[PDB]
Design a protein around this motif. Structure first.
Motif, mmCIF file in Angstrom:
data_model
loop_
_atom_site.group_PDB
_atom_site.id
_atom_site.type_symbol
_atom_site.label_atom_id
_atom_site.label_comp_id
_atom_site.label_asym_id
_atom_site.label_seq_id
_atom_site.Cartn_x
_atom_site.Cartn_y
_atom_site.Cartn_z
ATOM 1 N N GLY A 6 -9.817 -9.016 -11.802
ATOM 2 C CA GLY A 6 -10.361 -7.674 -11.710
ATOM 3 C C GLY A 6 -9.653 -6.626 -12.553
ATOM 4 N N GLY A 7 -8.528 -6.986 -13.162
ATOM 5 C CA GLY A 7 -7.828 -6.020 -13.990
ATOM 6 C C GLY A 7 -6.454 -5.612 -13.490
ATOM 7 N N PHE A 8 -6.033 -4.403 -13.864
ATOM 8 C CA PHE A 8 -4.718 -3.865 -13.506
ATOM 9 C C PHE A 8 -4.759 -2.594 -12.664
ATOM 10 N N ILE A 9 -3.638 -2.314 -11.999
ATOM 11 C CA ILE A 9 -3.458 -1.098 -11.208
ATOM 12 C C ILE A 9 -2.047 -0.610 -11.502
ATOM 13 N N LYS A 10 -1.825 0.688 -11.331
ATOM 14 C CA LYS A 10 -0.511 1.265 -11.569
ATOM 15 C C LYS A 10 0.254 1.310 -10.251
ATOM 16 N N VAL A 11 1.532 0.968 -10.305
ATOM 17 C CA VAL A 11 2.376 0.974 -9.116
ATOM 18 C C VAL A 11 3.729 1.591 -9.436
ATOM 19 N N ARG A 12 4.504 1.875 -8.393
ATOM 20 C CA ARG A 12 5.834 2.434 -8.569
ATOM 21 C C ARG A 12 6.820 1.363 -8.132
ATOM 22 N N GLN A 13 7.810 1.100 -8.975
ATOM 23 C CA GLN A 13 8.809 0.086 -8.683
ATOM 24 C C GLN A 13 10.065 0.649 -8.021
ATOM 25 N N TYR A 14 10.356 0.163 -6.817
ATOM 26 C CA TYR A 14 11.550 0.564 -6.076
ATOM 27 C C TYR A 14 12.420 -0.677 -5.992
ATOM 28 N N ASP A 15 13.723 -0.513 -6.185
ATOM 29 C CA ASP A 15 14.613 -1.660 -6.136
ATOM 30 C C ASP A 15 15.501 -1.700 -4.896
ATOM 31 N N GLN A 16 16.075 -2.875 -4.647
ATOM 32 C CA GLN A 16 16.960 -3.091 -3.513
ATOM 33 C C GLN A 16 16.370 -2.580 -2.201
ATOM 34 N N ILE A 17 15.125 -2.960 -1.936
ATOM 35 C CA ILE A 17 14.448 -2.556 -0.711
ATOM 36 C C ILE A 17 14.575 -3.676 0.315
ATOM 37 N N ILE A 18 14.981 -3.317 1.526
ATOM 38 C CA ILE A 18 15.136 -4.296 2.587
ATOM 39 C C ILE A 18 13.818 -4.494 3.321
ATOM 40 N N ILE A 19 13.499 -5.746 3.620
ATOM 41 C CA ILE A 19 12.280 -6.072 4.338
ATOM 42 C C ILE A 19 12.570 -7.188 5.332
ATOM 43 N N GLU A 20 11.818 -7.209 6.423
ATOM 44 C CA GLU A 20 11.982 -8.252 7.416
ATOM 45 C C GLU A 20 10.635 -8.928 7.577
ATOM 46 N N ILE A 21 10.634 -10.250 7.458
ATOM 47 C CA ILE A 21 9.414 -11.030 7.570
ATOM 48 C C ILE A 21 9.637 -12.222 8.491
ATOM 49 N N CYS A 22 8.918 -12.232 9.609
ATOM 50 C CA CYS A 22 9.028 -13.305 10.589
ATOM 51 C C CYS A 22 10.470 -13.517 11.037
ATOM 52 N N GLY A 23 11.213 -12.421 11.167
ATOM 53 C CA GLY A 23 12.593 -12.513 11.609
ATOM 54 C C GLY A 23 13.617 -12.686 10.506
ATOM 55 N N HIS A 24 13.157 -12.994 9.299
ATOM 56 C CA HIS A 24 14.068 -13.185 8.179
ATOM 57 C C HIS A 24 14.226 -11.904 7.370
ATOM 58 N N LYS A 25 15.471 -11.478 7.181
ATOM 59 C CA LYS A 25 15.750 -10.277 6.407
ATOM 60 C C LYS A 25 15.994 -10.623 4.941
ATOM 61 N N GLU B 73 0.850 -1.193 0.000
ATOM 62 C CA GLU B 73 0.000 0.000 0.000
ATOM 63 C C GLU B 73 0.884 1.241 0.000
ATOM 64 N N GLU B 74 0.312 2.383 -0.371
ATOM 65 C CA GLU B 74 1.078 3.625 -0.433
ATOM 66 C C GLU B 74 1.890 3.910 0.817
ATOM 67 N N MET B 75 3.183 4.115 0.610
ATOM 68 C CA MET B 75 4.100 4.400 1.696
ATOM 69 C C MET B 75 5.345 5.014 1.090
ATOM 70 N N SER B 76 6.126 5.688 1.921
ATOM 71 C CA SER B 76 7.352 6.306 1.446
ATOM 72 C C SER B 76 8.490 5.288 1.435
ATOM 73 N N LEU B 77 9.265 5.274 0.354
ATOM 74 C CA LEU B 77 10.412 4.378 0.232
ATOM 75 C C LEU B 77 11.570 5.152 -0.397
ATOM 76 N N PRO B 78 12.815 4.768 -0.075
ATOM 77 C CA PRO B 78 14.018 5.425 -0.599
ATOM 78 C C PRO B 78 14.384 5.047 -2.030
ATOM 79 N N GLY B 79 15.170 5.912 -2.664
ATOM 80 C CA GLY B 79 15.631 5.656 -4.017
ATOM 81 C C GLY B 79 14.707 6.090 -5.134
ATOM 82 N N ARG B 80 15.163 5.905 -6.364
ATOM 83 C CA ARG B 80 14.356 6.272 -7.508
ATOM 84 C C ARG B 80 13.360 5.151 -7.785
ATOM 85 N N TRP B 81 12.358 5.448 -8.599
ATOM 86 C CA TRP B 81 11.338 4.471 -8.924
ATOM 87 C C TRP B 81 10.907 4.618 -10.372
ATOM 88 N N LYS B 82 10.291 3.565 -10.898
ATOM 89 C CA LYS B 82 9.820 3.533 -12.276
ATOM 90 C C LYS B 82 8.363 3.068 -12.296
#
Ligand SMILES: Cc1ccccc1CNC(=O)[C@H]1N(C(=O)[C@@H](O)[C@H](Cc2ccccc2)NC(=O)c2cccc(O)c2C)CSC1(C)C
Lengths: 99, 99
Positions: free
Chosen positions: A51-70, A34-43
């Protein structure tokens, strides 16, 4: 962990300094949040499915942590109905389907 | 078996006596298949995907085989990107997510 599919497989994730609930989705090629601020450039990019398509912004090399796994990878930001963790990141935490 | 997610988790299913390719989708609550002929009566159903909500036809107690695993359940038919094997059937065949 072993997650059953009786209910939606929702997990807590940490991205861009904030906590969010997200769905472990093997059907999604990528990760869309969902809409949120992220670092770096985007495309700009379009993703589609039921249901179809939606437009999004692609950010690369983003770090995320899920259930303790980075994990690191591309993250799409847009008007998704649900925060979704896709295969591009699921592979990174060693997630597999078993039956 | 244990399926990794480096590529789409596509499998061969059998429904209506015919083989078809489908996606093991943990992000889908239901199983949605491309237009085909199923027996019995159907009822209305609205499902919400990445692009929004759509109307589909719900058929219950449909015989379907997934990668050799026999199952009998609810199959929805409508305009879908690919044949989607959702949680209702993934759970039936004992499929879980693991990491
Ligand atoms: C989601 C995403 C992320 C990154 C890049 C592309 C995409 C688009 N891909 C897709 O949309 C793929 N879909 C997926 O990945 C699905 O898991 C999808 C995820 C989702 C959940 C809640 C809101 C919105 C979306 N779920 C559903 O479409 C869905 C949701 C609820 C009931 C139901 O019967 C279905 C089929 C099924 S169709 C698909 C195989 C093309």
């Amino acid at each position: 962990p072993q997650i059953t599919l009786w209910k939606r497989p929702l997990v807590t994730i940490k991205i861009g300094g904030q906590l969010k609930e997200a769905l472990l989705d093997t059907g999604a090629d990528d990760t869309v949040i969902e809409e949120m601020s992220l670092p770096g450039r985007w495309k700009p990019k379009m993703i589609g499915g039921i249901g179809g398509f939606i437009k999004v912004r692609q950010y690369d090399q983003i770090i995320i942590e899920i259930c303790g796994h980075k994990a690191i990878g591309t993250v799409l930001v847009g008007p998704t109905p649900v925060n979704i963790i896709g295969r591009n990141l699921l592979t990174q935490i060693g997630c597999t389907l078993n039956f």
